[PDB]
Amino acid sequence: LASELSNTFGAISSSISDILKRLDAVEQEAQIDRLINGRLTSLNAFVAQQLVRSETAARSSQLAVDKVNECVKSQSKRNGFCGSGNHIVSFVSNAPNGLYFFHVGYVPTAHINATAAYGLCNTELPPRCIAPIDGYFVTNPEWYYTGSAFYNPEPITLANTRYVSKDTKYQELNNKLPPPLLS
Amino acid sequence: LYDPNMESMYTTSLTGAILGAAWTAGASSFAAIPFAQSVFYRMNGIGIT
Amino acid sequence: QEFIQTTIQKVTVDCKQYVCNGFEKCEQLLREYGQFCAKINQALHGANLRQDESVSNLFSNIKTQATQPLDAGLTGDFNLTLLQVPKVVTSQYSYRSAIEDLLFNKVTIADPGYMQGYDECMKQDLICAQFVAGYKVLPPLYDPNMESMYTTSLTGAILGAAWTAGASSFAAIPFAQSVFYRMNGIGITQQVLSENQKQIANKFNQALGAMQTGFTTTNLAFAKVQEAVNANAQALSKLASELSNTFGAISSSISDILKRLDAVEQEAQIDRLINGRLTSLNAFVAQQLVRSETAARSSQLAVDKVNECVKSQSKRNGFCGSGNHIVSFVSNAPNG
Amino acid sequence: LASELSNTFGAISSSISDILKRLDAVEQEAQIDRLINGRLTSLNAFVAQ
Amino acid sequence: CGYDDVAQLFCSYESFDVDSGVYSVSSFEAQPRGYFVEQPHSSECDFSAMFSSQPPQVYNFSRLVFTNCNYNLTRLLSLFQVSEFSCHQVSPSALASGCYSSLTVDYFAYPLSMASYLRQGSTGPIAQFNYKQDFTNPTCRILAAVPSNVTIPLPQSYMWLTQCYTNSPSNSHYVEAGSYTPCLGLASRGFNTFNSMHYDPATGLTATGSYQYISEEALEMAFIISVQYGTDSNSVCPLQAVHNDTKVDDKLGRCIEYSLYGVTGRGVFQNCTPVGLKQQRFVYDGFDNLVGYHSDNGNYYCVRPCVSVPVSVIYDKATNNHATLFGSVACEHVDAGPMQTSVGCVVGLVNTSLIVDNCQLPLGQSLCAVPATSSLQLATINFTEPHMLTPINSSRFIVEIPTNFSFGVT
Amino acid sequence: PLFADGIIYPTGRSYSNISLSYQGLFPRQGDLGRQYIYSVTHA
Ligand SMILES: *[C@@H]1O[C@H](CO)[C@@H](O[C@@H]2O[C@H](CO)[C@@H](O[C@@H]3O[C@H](CO)[C@@H](O)[C@H](O)[C@@H]3O)[C@H](O)[C@H]2NC(C)=O)[C@H](O)[C@H]1NC(C)=O
Ligand SMILES: *[C@@H]1O[C@H](CO)[C@@H](O[C@@H]2O[C@H](CO)[C@@H](O)[C@H](O)[C@H]2NC(C)=O)[C@H](O)[C@H]1NC(C)=O
Ligand SMILES: *[C@@H]1O[C@H](CO)[C@@H](O[C@@H]2O[C@H](CO)[C@@H](O)[C@H](O)[C@H]2NC(C)=O)[C@H](O)[C@H]1NC(C)=O
Ligand SMILES: *[C@@H]1O[C@H](CO)[C@@H](O[C@@H]2O[C@H](CO)[C@@H](O)[C@H](O)[C@H]2NC(C)=O)[C@H](O)[C@H]1NC(C)=O
Ligand SMILES: CCCCC/C=C\C/C=C\CCCCCCCC(=O)O
Ligand SMILES: *[C@@H]1O[C@H](CO)[C@@H](O)[C@H](O)[C@H]1NC(C)=O
Ligand SMILES: *[C@@H]1O[C@H](CO)[C@@H](O)[C@H](O)[C@H]1NC(C)=O
Ligand SMILES: *[C@@H]1O[C@H](CO)[C@@H](O)[C@H](O)[C@H]1NC(C)=O
Ligand SMILES: *[C@@H]1O[C@H](CO)[C@@H](O)[C@H](O)[C@H]1NC(C)=O
Ligand SMILES: *[C@@H]1O[C@H](CO)[C@@H](O)[C@H](O)[C@H]1NC(C)=O
Ligand SMILES: *[C@@H]1O[C@H](CO)[C@@H](O)[C@H](O)[C@H]1NC(C)=O
Ligand SMILES: *[C@@H]1O[C@H](CO)[C@@H](O)[C@H](O)[C@H]1NC(C)=O
After folding, report:
1. Do chains F and C touch (3 or more CB pairs under 8 A)?
2. Ligand 6 lined by C221 (C-beta under 6 Å)
3. Residue C299 backbone dihedrals phi, psi, to 5 degrees
4. d(C-alpha B48, C-alpha B42), whole Å
5. Distances (CA, A) of C130 to A101, C17, C114
């Protein structure tokens, strides 16, 4: 906006004073009208670009409202939106032209391979099978329970299992039985 | 529209915001739970026992 | 089928060559407008830089940490070969899958030529007009093989289990069992899924086979792909065809003005041409900036769509697809 | 779009009839070409918007 | 700024420091060198009709149209003492310098005291009933005096029409631009001291005119000329605009200037497959540009615009090293050293099969320039491979479960 | 016009394998014109 004022637009000068002190009345009118038309067109272009930028900023502000409502006032369960991996807590601070977010997430570093099962059933006539809740049935047989985000074998109880129908892919336990499957 | 002090007040009040508990899905109750316990419950919900 | 555009064509313009077409008198007259040409070049350079960073962010976000092989005999009764790199390759791209071949072959795209475009143009058209008008189409950040690598690694991506909500564990579960659990999660009991394995596999294979022959005129997402290609071509066409505007002069070419008029009239007509071409270049730069921000926002939406539909099963009805979402596959497309 | 038609763009009038009835042939060509260029640029801006 | 491309980059940014990056700069413009000139033997334009007889009056102007001929403009101009000239969309120097498809001359005997009546906006009797200049073509009106009375025979007097009407002056018949007056038959009777009006009883037409006298003074004439461009295969050329014929058989493939039967320009000529019409000699596209030429040697040459090689600079600020990227062109056309990449021919890079994860100077097509602690290295962007996991063949599955963790801030 | 009836070619140029909009002197489509017949004398 500031540097478009030096455009001569075809005139002998980009300043009115030089045109006024260099030419006669008709030529002054012609050169000044040239400058007027050029500057009006530039101002129209500036108005158009400011309208585009303002609508874009309004849309981005609505997106920032959504981001605050999802990440700062709650814990998002859909991965990849707030941050990377499992979102834990987010903090929002003021920025010169908007909002700056700090998405703190859970980043694992070391992974081990564990043998896991889909579920466990005994050989009773109405066979009751159990499935893990937010975890896995790990082993190494004797089966334990672990969390999905950290490896820690734990006893299989009714606090981490849910009863499910029998499937052909479930392990049939005969020698040892967890208290959910015992009677 | 707002001087930077008001904007920083708005963004600062969000850090210590109390919300509904982790097991209560909603925004109708204000549970005065400390930050350590809230972090504990947030880490519990992603798969850590 | 859904197409999300992640990028536009990167164009840079030589302002002096575009305005004056290598004429010394026009260059002497344009020396009064050097700062405007410099500003045009700098704005285009900044837009192209922002586009490159946006593409890098896109391909950084959709990266996978674990992948399983999905060749025939390991995916069960599900035919997934349409999403995989063919064993016999003729695509010129050793990592491009068959469905990406069908996508790219049925779109009318003029080949720009990043290696010998000048030589091919002079040996024997908005692509040959780069060296005439005074612009140049910049090549994309990644070759198509790397983009094919990124998109094909998402097909066999190993994720956490269905019951384990999260992305911290990598459960090596076969595709058949993953589809079984995805269908169980929408409200189908285990008995139905165990009794209808062959029918489910047949219906999945039928859906993919119909997905093969679906890039025709009726298809609307393919029309979106062609519309993005047409928008790029229309920008290039406007840039090339604005050079024939006389802007009130006796001719739109400097040579006729030089050979048909005296000195003062030459100065006036060439100044009219210079002003018109500078205004046209300013309008082109503004349009390119607008399209760049639009493409960046749409690429962020593509990141969200990948993270929601490809790397997990969506519980939001109507977001990924109609009805209950089961599984989604993403493949490389022109400009998205 | 409607009000861009009253722009003289530097001509003696924003209407073609006054230019036709006020000037000789060559000046008519000049002023009408001025109006044509102004209106074409206005239409291009409208199309972009 | 003209030393090399990095100094041109510094001049374009108008600062002694610029940030690192790949910057486009001015292309390698190839100015036209060499000439292809093809012209016919032609003949002399016959101007003897103007000099052999008495000049006519303004209402009875004579017209000469010339096509496919050469004329000595200096000899014609040396016979007249030009008093004034007004030109539209052309200049007399360009008329003496270039060629045109046709040349039309309207000449008549005209007194120099009435010179203002032949100008653009005039509303006197001359512009209303005698002659109105046509401005649909590039025109020049020339008013001159004839010094020697043996050049053109002297007419008796200057004569013109003052008004031409049917019944009353409110029904006057105005002349058209470049056309003859409706009162030509009445004005053919002449105007003198005795005769100043002529009337016809049949159609009712009336014509009134005035006169001057020529007695022992030089003859004064008026010439209204007009030219056309691109409307014929042959051209009208002044003899000072006729050059020696050269051949294109040695200037193929490069930007050269041409003058083909009066059509001038610059371009690149190639021996192309004959298309279009041989007799019209010129092939044009939809934008009125010459794209082909049927030459007199039997060959068809396709005309192409002069092109410039795009040039880019790969600049690194910290090491102060620069490299030149020629976009989409083989290294033979340009003729460490030059080498062929996927994005064109680069100069100043060293190829060592280096693979990098991230880099700040991307050249496109997964190629980028990496500074070495000294010249920049041509490297490739690395694609890290995901950890491959193979499912086992049982009712159990292997899962990778974390045992250590950190907190990442996005 | 589908057989290019009464088309006057441009005087000093030619075009190859394009479609161009040209403003000039052309006969109107569907115009019957005037038909003239020259006969033979009595014999
Ligand atoms: C086209 O042809 C017609 C003839 O059909 C020309 O008109 C004739 O012009 C002559 C000379 O101007 C006239 O002769 C004069 O007659 C008057 C009496 O009215 C007499 O006083 C003069 O001394 C002279 O003899 C003639 O009457 C006239 N005839 C008619 C029927 O109009 C006409 O001039 C020709 N057009 C051009 C441009 O030459
Ligand atoms: C064009 O006309 C000029 C005359 O204005 C010619 O110049 C004369 O040429 C003759 C014969 O060559 C000489 O005797 C004279 O001395 C020249 N000058 C003058 C002033 O008459 C010129 O030769 C003509 N050009 C052509 C190509 O015929
Ligand atoms: C216009 O002027 C020409 C001369 O430039 C006149 O032509 C002459 O006409 C007379 C009789 O009509 C003949 O005897 C001459 O031989 C002609 N000379 C030439 C050079 O053509 C012509 O008559 C004039 N026309 C009018 C209407 O006055
Ligand atoms: C005449 O023009 C048509 C239209 O451009 C040309 O047809 C094209 O031919 C190429 C083969 O080189 C095809 O790839 C295009 O798809 C064709 N276009 C259309 C619209 O059919 C035709 O080749 C040209 N003829 C000559 C002799 O050059
Ligand atoms: C000189 C006559 C007296 C002037 C004062 C009287 C009236 C003014 C009104 C109209 C003038 C219009 C004609 C202008 C003359 C231009 C010269 C020419 O057409 O050749
Ligand atoms: C899978 O589909 C392809 C065609 O897409 C076909 O060639 C192949 O035979 C199919 N495989 C099976 C096992 O049906
Ligand atoms: C030209 O004028 C001179 C002046 O004396 C005279 O001698 C000569 O005869 C004139 N020529 C003609 C053709 O009238
Ligand atoms: C043209 O060639 C002739 C000899 O054929 C020579 O005398 C003349 O100088 C040449 N003219 C130019 C302009 O080269
Ligand atoms: C040009 O091409 C024609 C055939 O198209 C050939 O007959 C002629 O010899 C060629 N001339 C040159 C100089 O290559
Ligand atoms: C770089 O060198 C390697 C090894 O010789 C070669 O394979 C490769 O093609 C070279 N690349 C270029 C661009 O020359
Ligand atoms: C490039 O990526 C591969 C994995 O695909 C990795 O083994 C190698 O170390 C990487 N190279 C560099 C220089 O980082
Ligand atoms: C986890 O990694 C950190 C950093 O390497 C280390 O200090 C810590 O002892 C590790 N903990 C375990 C349980 O491996």
Report:
1. no
2. no
3. -70, -35
4. 10
5. 43, 11, 12
Tokens of E294: 């049927």
C-alpha to C-alpha distance for D26 and D34, rounded to whole angstroms: 12
E358 CB-side CA count, 13 A: 6
Structure method: cryo-EM
| Distance from C-alpha of C58 to C-alpha of C332, rounded to nearest angstrom | 12
Strand E263-271, strand E219-228: pairing: unpaired
Q: Distance between CA C267 and CA C255 in Å, rounded?
A: 13
The chain B residue lying nearest C165, using CA atoms, is: B46
- For E285, the 3-state DSSP assignment is coil
Nearest by Cα to E184 from E193, E194, E192, E173: E173
Q: Which of E130, E139, E136, E111 shows the shortest CA–CA distance to E55?
A: E111
Q: Looking at this protein, which amino acid is placed at residue A72?
A: V
How far, in Å, from the CA of E281 to the mean position of ligand 8? Answer: 26
Q: Which two tokens stand for residue E266?
A: 């610059």
Closest protein CA for atom 10 of ligand 10? E351
The torsion region of residue C94 among left (phi > 0), alpha (psi -120 to 50) and beta comes to alpha
Please tell me the distance from the alpha carbon of residue C70 to that of residue C85, in angstroms, as a whole number.
11
Burial annotation A87-121 (CB, 10 A radius, 16+ → b, else e): bbbbebeeeeeebebebbbbbbeebeebbbbbbbb
- Spacing of C-alpha E337 from chain mean position: 41
Rounded to the nearest 5°, which phi and psi values hold at E173?
A: -105, 110
Rg (CA), chain D: 11
- DSSP, collapsed to helix, strand or coil, labels residue E377 as strand
Round to whole Å and give the CA distance between E182 and E174: 8
B8 sits in the region (left: phi over 0; alpha: psi -120 to 50; else beta) called alpha
Assess A114–B contact: CB distance below 8 Å, yes or no.
Answer: no
Q: Which ligand is nearest to the CA of E286?
A: 4
Strands of the sheet with E282-284, listed across from one edge: E35-38, E255-260, E263-271, E300-304, E290-294, E282-284, F14-15
Q: Dihedrals φ, ψ of E23, to 5°?
A: -110, 135
Strand partners, F24: none
Angle subtended by helix axes C263-305 and A25-67, to nearest 10: 10
Residues forming beta bridges with residue C192, ordered by sequence position? none
Name residue C133's amino acid.
A
E270 neighbors E301 (Cβ within 8 angstroms)? yes
Which residue from C minimizes the CA distance to B48? C168
DSSP H helices, E191-310, are: none
E261/E55 Cα distance (integer angstroms): 33
Contact status, residue A118 vs residue A109, Cβ threshold 8 Å: no
SS3 C173: coil
| β-strands E396-409, C170-171 pairing | antiparallel
Distance CA B24, CA A11 (A): 72
Rounded Cα–Cα distance for residues C77 and A63 (Å) = 43
The packing angle between helices C263-305 and C34-61, to 10°, is 10
Of chain A residues 115-134, which have a CB less than 8 A from chain C? 116, 118, 131-134
From the CA of C206, the nearest ligand is 6
| CA gap C315, C295 in Å, rounded | 27
Q: A152 touching B, CB under 8 A?
A: yes
